[PDB]
């Protein structure tokens, strides 16, 4: 129950303001950045700032503090998911989100912040449905805003009827400093690109372990879905009954399902390293990179980052495969190898200098974090199986799919 949805600058003046209830006075926005500094410098950097009986919830985009005030007992995750959905809607309109937009596209953004919320309540937050009655180029509102099926306005027609599925692996990993796996989980996300005609219905075929166990085919290759969180479009009770993903799809880009399993198959890229940190002289990185997966796939454009001392100097990089640039902006090396086959080992040996006079504060030990990406390969073993198009017309659509293996936060610890 926000009382004023704010967008501030990085200083503390108002880019755009939109109050609803009168519970928070408009003068109360002026205290936000001093409270931010006075709570940030003492370890209490919290998303819920406090000013007497007036609270401050906020998220931080690149140049923007989407501040959301409240005075009573606000439902908090409501307001934060409201603010992230406002961020995603504005990124659907304005492909970048800066101060150049807000102080100049203020014709339409006040109307958006009138539409999204009344008396503190998020009510109509789909981007595509908000497009067809809020334009920057007005009729009656579409009934899709009022209708139960609220993410697909009827009357959409394309000449062909293409549906593109993108299955994205994102391996999260955190290997400890001894050489063992702490956590090998996989956050997978199926992102679909749907161009269909009318009001269709799709039923997705997965090789689920649970659906095969309800059928009687849990002895072939299947995926153990430890948890799945679907989009709003999937009728969840039909999934609760017999693992059935029934949904009226949206138009264009959307995220279908956000699953999260565990997998005790080996890590994809192994990073053994040593650090001979001689004091006040130099440092050595005899790091090796082997791949545990099969010898058929190729890892595109990997970026094996290794954090270095903050004030090192005169780098040398004797490699065998792949370029190095030393990036002192974040004080990191970026060991990049473009074409990376499976099962091979590429060795790299760096060598720096280090200052004589020691620093005032210590530097911290950030982790190695690689940025690999592999197509046509899944570590999970998940395969999509079927996708039925249901339509009163009845036609031949073309469901296309590809398999992407990426990283999530693929960190490996250092010494």
């Amino acid at each position: 129950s926000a009382s004023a949805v704010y967008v501030l600058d990085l200083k503390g003046k108002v880019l755009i303001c939109r109050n609803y209830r009168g519970d928070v006075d408009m003068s109360e926005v002026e205290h936000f950045m001093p409270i931010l500094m006075e709570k940030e410098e003492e370890g209490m950097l919290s998303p819920i700032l406090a000013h007497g009986g007036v609270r401050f919830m906020w998220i931080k985009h690149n140049n923007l503090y989407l501040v959301a005030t409240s005075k009573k007992n606000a439902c908090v995750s409501l307001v934060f998911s409201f603010l992230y959905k406002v961020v995603q809607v504005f990124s659907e309109y304005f492909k970048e989100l800066e101060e150049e937009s807000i102080r100049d596209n203020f014709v339409i953004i006040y109307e958006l912040l009138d539409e999204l919320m009344d008396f503190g309540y998020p009510q109509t937050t789909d981007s595509k449905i908000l497009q067809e009655y809020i334009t920057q180029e007005a009729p009656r509102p579409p009934a899709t805003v009022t209708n139960a099926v609220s993410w697909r306005s009827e009357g959409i027609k394309y000449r062909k009827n293409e549906v593109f599925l993108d299955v994205i692996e994102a391996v999260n990993l955190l290997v400890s400093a001894n050489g063992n796996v702490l956590r090998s989980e996989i956050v997978g996300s199926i992102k679909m690109r749907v161009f269909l005609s009318g009001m269709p219905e799709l039923r997705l075929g997965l090789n689920d372990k649970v659906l095969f166990d309800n059928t009687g085919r849990g002895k072939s290759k299947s995926v153990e879905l430890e948890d799945v969180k679907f989009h709003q479009c999937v009728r969840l009770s039909r999934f609760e009954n017999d693992r059935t993903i029934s949904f009226i799809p949206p138009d264009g880009e959307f995220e279908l399902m956000s699953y999260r399993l565990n997998t005790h198959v080996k890590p994809l890229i192994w990073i053994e390293s040593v650090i001979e940190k001689h004091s006040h002289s130099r440092i050595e990185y005899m790091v090796k990179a082997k791949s545990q997966f099969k010898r058929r796939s190729t890892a595109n454009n990997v970026e094996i980052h290794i954090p270095v001392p903050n004030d090192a100097d005169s780098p040398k990089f004797k490699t065998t495969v792949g370029s190095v640039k030393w990036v002192p902006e974040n004080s990191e090396i970026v060991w990049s190898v473009k074409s990376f086959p499976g099962g091979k080992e590429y060795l790299m040996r760096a060598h720096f200098g280090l200052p004589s006079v020691e620093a005032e504060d210590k530097e911290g030990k950030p982790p190695i974090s690689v940025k690999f990406e592999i197509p046509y390969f899944t570590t999970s073993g998940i395969q999509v199986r079927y996708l039925k198009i249901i339509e009163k017309s009845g036609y031949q659509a073309l469901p296309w799919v590809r398999y992407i293996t990426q990283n999530g936060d693929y960190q490996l610890r250092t010494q």
């Binding site: 203020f106 009344d118 009656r140």
Partner: protein, 132 residues
């Protein structure tokens, strides 16, 4: 300086008052003290255009407490705008009726809100539900 803007506001041409109200809410965006421009932007409100009345509703919302005595001159326009075939302007007038926090105003605002409760198109119904 603002007398020039009030003179643009007291014109009769559409593309003058549209730039006038955009200049008013551009001053209100950075928070320039435009509170003396209340009693004449109330006049340039009953318009056929829709991208303009959202800005005037925005001005009435942001300066409702600011002019507690002059704010009576919107209620007949509210009960006119809550009687339209296009439901968007009705529900817009409804969700602006509720945010105006003046006790002298809310005396006359009950019966059009009652009429907008039992309306057909569910947009204004769910908007009047929040206005309750």
């Amino acid at each position: 300086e603002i007398f020039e803007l009030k003179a643009e506001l007291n014109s009769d041409k559409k593309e003058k008052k549209k730039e006038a109200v955009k200049k008013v809410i551009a001053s209100m965006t950075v928070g320039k003290d435009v509170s003396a421009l209340f009693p004449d932007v109330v006049n340039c409100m009953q318009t056929d255009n829709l991208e303009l009345k959202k800005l005037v509703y925005l001005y009435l919302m942001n300066y409702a407490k600011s002019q507690p005595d002059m704010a009576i001159m919107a209620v007949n326009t509210f009960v006119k705008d809550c009687e339209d075939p296009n439901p968007l302007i009705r529900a817009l007038a409804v969700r602006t009726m509720g945010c105006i926090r003046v006790d002298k105003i809310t005396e006359y605002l009950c019966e059009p809100l009652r009429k907008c409760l039992k309306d057909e198109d569910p947009y204004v119904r769910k908007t009047a539900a929040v206005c309750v």
